[PDB]
Structures are given as C-alpha cells and as structure tokens.
Design a binder for this molecule. Structure first.
Ligand SMILES: Cc1cc2nc3c(=O)[nH]c(=O)nc-3n(C[C@H](O)[C@H](O)[C@H](O)COP(=O)(O)O)c2cc1C
Ligand SMILES: Cc1cc2nc3c(=O)[nH]c(=O)nc-3n(C[C@H](O)[C@H](O)[C@H](O)COP(=O)(O)O)c2cc1C
Ligand SMILES: [Cl-]
Ligand SMILES: [Cl-]
Ligand SMILES: [Cl-]
Ligand SMILES: [Cl-]
Ligand SMILES: [Cl-]
Ligand SMILES: [Cl-]
Ligand SMILES: [Mg+2]
Lengths: 346, 343
C-alpha cells in the first residue's frame, strides 16, 4: 500500500543553490532505493514537497526530513492513504526552483501560490494548537466529530491587570501582554500542552491526563520566568510589575467544532473550564500563585509537596490544592498596592 | 496612483463554462475602458483574481464584484498600494482554466496551489471575524497596532450548563450549544455587534457606544428566541431546558492582535470585560435575565424602563436592568427543574 503526503516549510536562513542541489541528488539516490517519488519546489524562502511511496518508506523519510537543520516551521498539509496511482512516477525527486522561472504564462500561478502560502502561514498562527495538530496528522479538522475527553484545563492571567490598564499607555500595555503571552505559550508548548485561546489577558490551555506533572512544571516555570524578568528590567519598565496567578482543573470536557455558519470555533465545554478559571481568580486570596483541584493532584506522579487549601465554592464546594514550590515570597495585597504606587505619578 | 489586489472566492453552483466565458468578455471590455489589468483563474470550484489599476477604478470594480452572485465567500488576501509597475500590463482580464491544463511540468504547481488554497479555506473558518476584516481591508494583522476603543461588552451563557453537561450525552450537548451559539451569533450580528469568541458555553461580543439600544435589543431578542424555542420542541428535547443570562458593561478596551510568532489571537483588554462577565453571573441571583452598568444605561436613548438593582460587589457598583428583562420564572426553581427533568 502507498501513501502521498504534502508539506510546507520555512527555509532556514539563506540557503545556497548548491546546497539545494545537495538535497536533490541525495533525495534522488535515496528515493530510488526506497521507490519514493515526488517533487520539491521552493519559492521566496519556502519549501513545498510532495512525497509518495509505500507507507513505511514514506514515514521513515518524513521522520528524517522533520529533523533536518535546513528548514523549520514544518507543516504537513495533506496525507492521502491507499493511493492508486503515483502522481510523479518518473521523478525520484524533481527539484523546481520557482524563483528562477520567468515565463509569462506561469507568473499568475506563481504569484497566487506565493500570496496564498504566505497568507496561510499567517493564519496558522491564529489556530488553536489542536487544529494544527489535526492538520499535521492528515485529518480535516472541520469533519472531526466532537469527543468527551479527559483534560487538565490551564488558566493563567496577570495580577492587578486592571491597575496596569488604568495607569499605562496602550502601547506599553500591549508590549507587556505580548511578552506575557509569548512566555506562557512557549513554555506550555514545550511541555506538550495545547494553547486554546487568549481571553483578555488570560491564557487558556489544556494538557492530557498523562501530563499532570508537566502542567504543574509549566505553571512553576511561568512563575519562575516572570520572577526572573522582573529583576532583569529597569524600574521604569512595566515588565518590572508582571506577576501571574494560575489555576488548573481536571475533568471531562467536550472538544471539537462548535458554532454555526456565521462563526465556528474549536471549543472546550465542561465544568473543568469554569473551575480552572475560578481557581485562577482565587490565587489572589491565597499565599500561593498556583491553585488546582484534587483531580489534578491525582494526575501527578512526581513527589510534589501537596498542600491542602481547604474547600472553596465555585459559582458543592471543591477541595483546592497547591504545591509548596508555588508559595509567594510576597504578600499579594502589598504587591497590588506597590503596582499602583509605582504607576502613580502624583 | 495605482493599487493591486488579489482575492479568492468560491464558484457558485451551476456555473457553466459559457457563463465564465461571458464574465471574461465583459471584464475585458470594462477593464480596457477603466485601464484595469489582471488575471482570473479558476480551479476545482474556486476563483482567483488579481486586479490592478488606479485606486478609485479598482475600488469601484471590486465593490461591484463583491455583490456578484456568481461567487461567494470572497476573501481579499492582499492589497498592494502605490505599485509602480503592473504585473500584467497587456491583459485587460486574462481568464485561465487551470482545470484544463494537463502539462506535466505545470501539474506540481497546480497541485500545490489547490492543496494550499483548500487548506487556507479551512483555516479561514476558525479565524476571528475581526482578523478576517483586517485582511480584507489590506491591513497586516501581525503589525497593525492595537487601539484603545470605547465598547459595550456583551457576555451571555447557558443557565445550569453544568447540570446539562453532567446529564446529557455528548452529541446532545453539542447540538444544544450549537443551537445556542447560532441564535446568539445571528442576533448579535443582525444588530451590528461583533462576536468576539466562545469560551465554554459563554458568548462574548462587543458593540460600539452608539449601539447601546442595539445591545439591549439583542439581549431581549436572544431571551425571546430561547423562550420561543423551549415551547417549540418536545419535553424530551434538551432545548426545552435552555435559558440564558446576559451581562453588559461599558468601558475602554484595548482591541487588537496579540501574542507571538508561536500563537496569535484577537483580544479585548480591559476592566469592562470582567465586569460584563460578573454581571452575567449575577443574573442567576436576580429576578431579571439581563444586568448592566450605569455606563451602558448612558449609551441608550430609547425609552426603556430602567430598573435600579442596588449596589453590588463584583468597591460596589450600581447594577441596572430593564423592565422587559424580568423573569417570568423563579431561577432556583428552574435549575432544580432542569436537574429533575434530566433524572
Ligand atoms: C526540504 C527538504 C527535502 C528533503 N527531501 C528529501 C527526500 O525527498 N529524500 C531524502 O532521502 N532526503 C531528503 N531530504 C534530506 C534528509 O533530511 C536527509 O538529509 C537525507 O535523507 C540524508 O540523511 P542521512 O545522511 O542521515 O542518510 C530533504 C531535506 C530537506 C531540507
Ligand atoms: C469572479 C468574478 C470576477 C469578475 N471580474 C470582473 C472584472 O475584472 N471586470 C469587470 O468589469 N467585471 C468583472 N466581473 C463581473 C462584475 O461583477 C459585473 O458582473 C460586470 O462588471 C457587469 O456589471 P454591470 O451590472 O455594471 O454591467 C467579475 C465577476 C466574477 C464573478
Ligand atoms: Cl527561496
Ligand atoms: Cl514570584
Ligand atoms: Cl512542591
Ligand atoms: Cl448557571
Ligand atoms: Cl424567558
Ligand atoms: Cl423596559
Ligand atoms: Mg488579570
């Protein structure tokens, strides 16, 4: 049985024509051995490749391509399974430099391909991570049926954000929120979590039930990086005032497409979403910057020092936990007052 | 001064090759007259068009193309301003049927164009409407600066949704939330509001300060349509149990594109967002399904019967409603009825 995959990628740095030639000859040699055929196109710093052959041979090759140093931001766009006919039966690997094609009748198609691909790469950034995952796996996200899944829900947001927005100019708030989002997204994604959306200054993400310790480590790493950042910058930098609170919950959530023709999105539905947001808010009243449910605790295997913060009610009460490592070295009320007083000019 | 634009669209059904030819014939005549050049391509049910010429000539033509019933789901991908040279100076409008091209050396580029565009159209379905607007207006959403704007913030969600999710099968929950979202989104959009996002079962939207009355009307209309729905369906249908609460607030919010190269989103930043969400939760404790701030009230000019609900801690703020938002039911009895109905 044969398959065919298509992917796009960003060429790492500036790549010479001779090293692009060094991809072609090795590809031709290996693909002839593996009975692989396909085409490699490049255009304005982007690679396009189509690979076809028996499934095991194609998957082995794509695993190696994925770790190749010469390109990055790799997104597989389409996978066709159990294909009847090869698309390029005579090309072990045909390389086409679309930049060098100056023919007048191909310029329209070449222009459209560059415009649509560059637009595609922008849109990719706005997708929930789950959608990018499904596309990478060759699954059309629009046709996926919703599933009840077990997830750890993550919410983190900015301490005293109302004071920051009240006292800072808009451009300074934007720099600060972008930095916060950049840090959260990088760390969540490094631990295998999936960012779902930004809501105001809040980052929403999920982890699997096998990722309880990764979820805690994510949260502590966020807190740790913010603490580092506050003493890295000057006192006139609003980043000097950036703190977070984090809530985690665990439960059954429905994951999938929701909405209508007018607006559709990837959503997560279930009690755990509300609980994680409420625990995120509760950290304001706690001497800890991370709060989570008993269910999150049961998903952890590491030797955390779990601390029981008692039962709290969520708009029936739920046990709230934290870890000793999440303890605040500051008093939260004193810090929100310091933030306001730091931003006071009078 | 000249501009160049590129858009993609979905060919409307039943569009034959003779009709596409007539499009080319008229385009050539009009574009020659207006000194417009470009190319029209089609492939597997999609149009691609590049248009270039003087700003006003191009804009007037594009406004016409926007209302042409021979295509739908039009997205202007890119606008180049102050172009120096035309890309197709000799083609008033060259029509290219990519479906008919069988040349072997073109097949790779044709295949990739179809793959990437179809994937692009999937991604578009998940994009924030505000980002799709910016792209259509030729604005780079990754570089355009967020702005401080005055907005009415709208928050609604489903009453006792925890009980619904606890007691219903997945496919039934999905049908129910989709219906709720479809109703909210259609009404908000009909009144000129902008749905921002879905957060769980919650709908977040915004209106301008000139849209105070429209925000109240939207809210009452959603409540009204849910009431209609509950007595349209049978008692075994979970939609029979669908109620909403709505909060509105007014304030300054930063609106824009935020994040990093790893993940972007469109967001509204400001205290008004939290206030609207807390007033939405407060309706559970109120004999009204709509609650809003003094600031919202000041944005209204219609002759509502405003009702003061006293100061509430969300310093406490004055909460208001309108007489029409009164609940004909007792909220705690409804939540107990939802629990009991699903037993
Ligand atoms: C864009 C791109 C496309 C590539 N395509 C192929 C290919 O089709 N076949 C292949 O064998 N190697 C291809 N490679 C290179 C592989 O990643 C790898 O360098 C090559 O298989 C040699 O691996 P080896 O020295 O460990 O055996 C490609 C690399 C890049 C950057
Ligand atoms: C995909 C598509 C592309 C079109 N491109 C052009 C064009 O480039 N120039 C043009 O005059 N009309 C174009 N039209 C048709 C116009 O929308 C309109 O039907 C035509 O200009 C006649 O308009 P009229 O009612 O003012 O006579 C296009 C229509 C479609 C569906
Ligand atoms: Cl290149
Ligand atoms: Cl800290
Ligand atoms: Cl610990
Ligand atoms: Cl509720
Ligand atoms: Cl009602
Ligand atoms: Cl009234
Ligand atoms: Mg905050």
């Amino acid at each position: 049985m044969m398959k065919r995959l298509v992917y796009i990628s960003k060429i790492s740095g500036h790549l010479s024509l001779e090293e692009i030639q060094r991809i072609g000859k090795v590809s031709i040699k290996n693909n002839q051995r593996d009975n692989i055929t396909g085409v490699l196109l490049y255009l304005q710093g982007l690679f396009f490749q189509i690979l076809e052959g028996e499934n095991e041979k194609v998957d082995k090759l794509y695993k190696k391509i994925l770790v190749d140093d010469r390109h990055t931001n790799i997104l597989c766009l389409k996978t066709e399974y159990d294909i009847t006919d090869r698309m390029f039966p005579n090309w072990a690997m045909k390389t086409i430099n679309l930049n060098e094609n100056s023919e007048l009748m191909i310029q329209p198609i070449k222009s459209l391909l560059q415009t649509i691909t560059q637009s595609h790469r922008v849109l990719e950034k706005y997708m929930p991570a789950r959608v990018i995952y499904l596309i990478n796996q060759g699954i059309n996200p629009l046709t996926v049926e919703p599933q009840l899944v077990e997830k750890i829900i993550f919410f983190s947001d900015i301490l005293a954000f109302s004071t920051l927005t009240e006292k800072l100019p808009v451009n300074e708030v934007v720099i600060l929120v972008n930095r916060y989002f950049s840090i959260c997204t990088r760390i969540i994604s490094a631990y295998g979590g999936e960012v779902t959306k930004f809501i105001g200054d809040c980052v929403m993400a999920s982890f699997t039930k096998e990722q309880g310790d990764a979820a805690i480590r994510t949260s502590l790493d966020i807190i740790s990086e913010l603490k580092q950042l506050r003493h890295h910058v000057e006192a006139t930098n609003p980043l000097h005032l950036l703190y977070t609170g984090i809530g985690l919950s665990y439960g059954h959530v429905i994951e999938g497409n929701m909405g209508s023709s007018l607006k559709m999105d990837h959503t997560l539905l279930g009690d755990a979403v509300n609980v994680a947001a409420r625990l995120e808010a509760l950290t304001r009243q706690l001497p800890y910057a991370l709060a989570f449910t008993a269910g999150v605790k049961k998903c952890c295997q590491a030797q955390w020092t779990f601390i029981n913060l008692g039962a709290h009610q969520v708009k029936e009460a739920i046990e709230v936990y934290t870890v000793n490592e999440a303890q605040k070295y500051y008093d939260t009320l004193q810090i929100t007052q310091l933030i306001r007083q730091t931003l006071e000019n009078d």
